[PDB]
Amino acid sequence: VQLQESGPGLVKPSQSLSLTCTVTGFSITSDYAWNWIRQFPGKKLEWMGYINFDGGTTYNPSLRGRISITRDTSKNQFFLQLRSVTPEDTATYYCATFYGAKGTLDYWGQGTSVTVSSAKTTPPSVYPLAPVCGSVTLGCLVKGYFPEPVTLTWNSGSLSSGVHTFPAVLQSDLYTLSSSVTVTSSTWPSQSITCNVAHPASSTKVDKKIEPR
């Protein structure tokens, strides 16, 4: 009924990728097949395989010899192992259910993003974007981080209307993105504007106060 993927978000090439799906609300031995599906950066979907409620497995021949799907019935969990990964295994990995008498992928987890890369986890530098000029739009430039993603919160999230988050791009091996916020000319710089930049992979949060001149 409810599925939740977990596991490392960054794996180096040539190593094994291991993920866990924790299932609640339904026993993985009672019915259904329990599947792994992945979505590549270009958004194509690939079914990888399943473990059935009786423990039998079936795998996509595209992954022949490289995949194992196993389970722990005591914890209502099932697992993916993908061996000898390369950067082409970078994808969002989903677990999902199948019922033989229907045939579709009915219930899905939220997905977990895995990056296969030799690049090192690096927290972002946060730089202010303020008008030189000599409504007002401000921003924060979030540069030099790896892997994805980051979240930018303006004034601890209070500031809701008029925030834009631009998707990150790679620049010399590291991600860069920016976020914009637009506020009434009456509130800045009279009231403080701060961006708060969270990078879960490095367990860091950094705040930058926007200053005028």
């Binding site: 958004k43 194509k44 979907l45 690939e46 079914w47 079936t58 996509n60 021949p61 595209s62 989903y94 999902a96 199948f98 229907k102 045939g103 579709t104 992928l105 009915d106 899905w108 987890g109 939220q110 997905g111 530098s125 730089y127 202010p128 974007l129 303020a130 008008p131 030189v132 000029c133 000599g134 739009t137 921003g139 430039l141 540069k143 834009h164 988050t165 631009f166 998707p167 990150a168 791009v169 620049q171 860069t176 993105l177 920016s178 914009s180 637009t182």
Partner: protein
């Protein structure tokens, strides 16, 4: 079995009909699913068995087809239908998906609001310089940005990033960032980002001068 969707992208006005085709390389006997995927979310089952509408979706959605040929139709497009739609066969293993069809809302034109930002003193101390231009709340998505440094166009070191279509007003926004070294940046005076968009007969310009 290979599943082919045509096309890969659709732009449709609110209230209009959309038709998404899916063709299987073999006969799949109606063992055909459709999924809707919104950004940041898992695919959600929409149609099973070619024609059966899943609970949680309205009758505006309908699946038809037989043999190798299947269609998902939306009779009257609504803003919450924005996303990517995939077909999937479950006739034979390995189960296979079509490549997806991304659906966006065709709304009225909207002109970009442009803002330009010099490199921060903080970034300059590290030896780099990024000049940032935001182009906010425009439609359609097609837009051309040109950077000029002391009046001369620069194309190297420019990175452009568009947001997804905004779920509220159906516009796009984008950042255009020009990255230079500190010494390259500090050798020139004027920095201009110029946007060409169908909402204006002339370029939409924002500039700053280091000598203020």
């Amino acid at each position: 079995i290979v599943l082919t969707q045509s096309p890969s992208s659709f732009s449709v006005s609110l209230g209009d009909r959309v038709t998404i085709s899916c063709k299987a390389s073999g006969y799949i006997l109606n063992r055909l699913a459709w999924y809707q995927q919104k950004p940041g979310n898992a695919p959600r089952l929409l149609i099973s068995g070619a024609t059966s509408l899943e609970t949680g979706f309205p009758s505006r959605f309908s699946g038809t087809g037989s043999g190798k040929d299947y269609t998902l139709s939306i009779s009257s497009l609504q803003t919450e239908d924005v996303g990517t739609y995939y077909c999937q066969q479950y006739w034979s293993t390995p189960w296979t998906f079509g490549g997806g069809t991304k659906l966006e809302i065709r709304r009225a034109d909207a002109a970009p609001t442009v803002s330009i930002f010099p490199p921060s003193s903080e970034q300059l101390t590290s030896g780099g310089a990024s000049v940032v231009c935001f182009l906010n709340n425009f439609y359609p998505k097609d837009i051309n940005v040109k950077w000029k440094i002391d009046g001369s166009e620069r194309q190297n070191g420019v990175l452009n990033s568009w947001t997804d279509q905004d779920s509220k007003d159906s516009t796009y926004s984008m950042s255009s960032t020009l990255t230079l070294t500190k010494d390259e940046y500090e050798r020139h005076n004027s920095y201009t980002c110029e946007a060409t968009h169908k909402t204006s007969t002339s370029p939409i310009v924002k500039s700053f001068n280091r000598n203020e």
